[PDB]
């Protein structure tokens, strides 16, 4: 099957600079055609730019916006693709995406990686427990969870028991704090027995900051 | 640059109906040596890339299911989903490859599940000790798997409606049982916190009058 794997992203002052990589298999990595297409958080599909294989002179072409700014390359032994993104800007700030499909029907694509282009600074969050209790339990079922306070930039993974927990969790979209800082919340539901038996414990990853919580989540 | 514009900006469609979403774009991609329209259709899942549907304006990619088909010509285009599925909730993009460098997306649609009113099950969050000691408290009111999304929660300190020291975020729809979650929180000095009965108070389509879920401090 085809897998294009991005890394790269992360949190780049205006004017600075970053390089995306993309590691391909499952093609012939020579013979194929990539573009950079980008999405804002929470906007559409921006195409980025071209590359040619060898074969027809690989050329590379970009969009007006990003034009004399990035430079699009290919590592044929590696089979890697590259994206240099030069005197960045805000509106830089964006998911961006190698893809292949020639013809330009872009028919695979990469999972993506974050670049946020911002002067302030990185933060990692506070995590406090969202304790089950009377008031947070119907049914036989209860709530419980992580409030994940105070971070930037996006993004923060949350875990449950170390990632053995998924069915019933909920990780809520982050709000912006008039503090220029994020916070969320990540809740699951479970039965209610389970609260006599099993230790709940969320697992926060900060990237960014190289910050990790792990937090037990008891009743009270 | 060929722009394209997609109708409407959402839909919302019961299990099982028909759900149909348009594209136009400001010149034709019909190529007259072949017949071919170079046209489009990506469907994109939250936290995934988009996904190729549809190419040639009509042709199903290999493994897409029968139940998504194109039609259209020249300036105009659609997609229906014969039958639409409660996995099927996405953001729609089509997209021109007839006039190369850009290539063009359109801006989206969103396709929503229009179910049965669902009222939310209401829990509510004290602030933990731990963040009690560093000056501040967050209380969390907590509206799991409710539809339709619009809801209004209000909070009260000692019965004393709350205004501008709260923050909300609402799930995308859930797609196995179509529903949303959400989750409000309330910010205060650990000082103003610790001088007052907290509520949240939920209005709702699906309540036949407002909920309100409430602790005291006294006894958490």
């Known amino acids: 099957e085809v897998q294009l794997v991005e890394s790269g992203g992360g949190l780049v002052k205006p004017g600075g600079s970053l390089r995306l990589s993309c590691a391909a298999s499952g093609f012939t990595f020579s013979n194929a055609w990539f573009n950079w297409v980008r999405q804002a958080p929470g906007k559409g599909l921006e195409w980025v730019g071209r590359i040619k294989t060898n074969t027809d002179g690989g050329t590379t072409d970009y969009a007006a916006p990003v034009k004399g700014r990035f430079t699009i390359s290919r590592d044929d032994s590696k089979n890697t693709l590259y994206l240099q993104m030069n005197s960045l800007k805000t509106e830089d700030t964006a998911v961006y995406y190698c893809?292949?499909?020639?013809?330009?029907?872009?028919?695979?694509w990469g999972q993506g990686t974050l670049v946020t282009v911002s002067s302030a600074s990185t933060k990692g969050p506070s995590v406090f427990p969202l304790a089950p209790s009377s008031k947070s339990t119907s049914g036989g079922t209860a709530a419980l969870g992580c409030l994940v306070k105070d971070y930037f930039p996006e993004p923060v993974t949350v875990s449950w028991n170390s990632g053995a927990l998924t069915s019933g969790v909920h990780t809520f979209p982050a709000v912006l704090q008039s503090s220029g800082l994020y916070s969320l919340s990540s809740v699951v539901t479970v039965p209610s027995s389970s609260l006599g038996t099993q230790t709940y414990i969320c697992n926060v990853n900060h990237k960014p900051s190289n910050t990790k919580v792990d937090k037990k989540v008891e009743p009270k | 640059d060929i722009v394209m514009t997609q109708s409407p900006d959402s839909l919302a469609v019961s299990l099982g109906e028909r759900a149909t979403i348009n594209c136009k774009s400001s010149?034709?991609?019909?190529?007259?040596?072949?017949?071919?329209?170079?046209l489009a259709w990506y469907q994109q899942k939250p936290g995934q890339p988009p996904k190729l549907l549809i190419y040639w304006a009509s042709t199903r990619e290999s493994g897409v299911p029968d139940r998504f088909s194109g039609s259209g010509s020249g300036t105009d285009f659609t997609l229906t989903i014969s039958s639409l599925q409660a996995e099927d909730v996405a953001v729609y993009y089509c997209?021109?490859?007839?006039?190369?460098?850009?290539?063009?997306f359109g801006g989206g649609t969103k396709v929503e599940i229009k179910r049965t009113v669902a009222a939310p099950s209401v829990f509510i969050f004290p602030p933990s000790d731990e963040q009690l000691k560093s000056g501040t408290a967050s209380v969390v009111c907590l509206l799991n798997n409710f539809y339709p999304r619009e809801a209004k929660v209000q909070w009260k300190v000692d019965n004393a409606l709350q205004s501008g020291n709260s923050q909300e975020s609402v799930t995308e729809q859930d797609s196995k049982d179509s529903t949303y979650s959400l989750s409000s929180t309330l910010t205060l000095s650990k000082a103003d916190y610790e001088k007052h009965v907290y509520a949240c108070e939920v209005t709702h389509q699906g309540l036949s009058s407002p909920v309100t879920k409430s602790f005291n401090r006294g006894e958490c």
């Open positions: 893809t292949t499909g020639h013809i330009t029907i872009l028919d695979y």
């Open positions: 997209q021109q490859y007839y006039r190369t460098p850009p290539l063009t």
């Open positions: 010149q034709s991609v019909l190529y007259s040596s072949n017949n071919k329209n170079y």
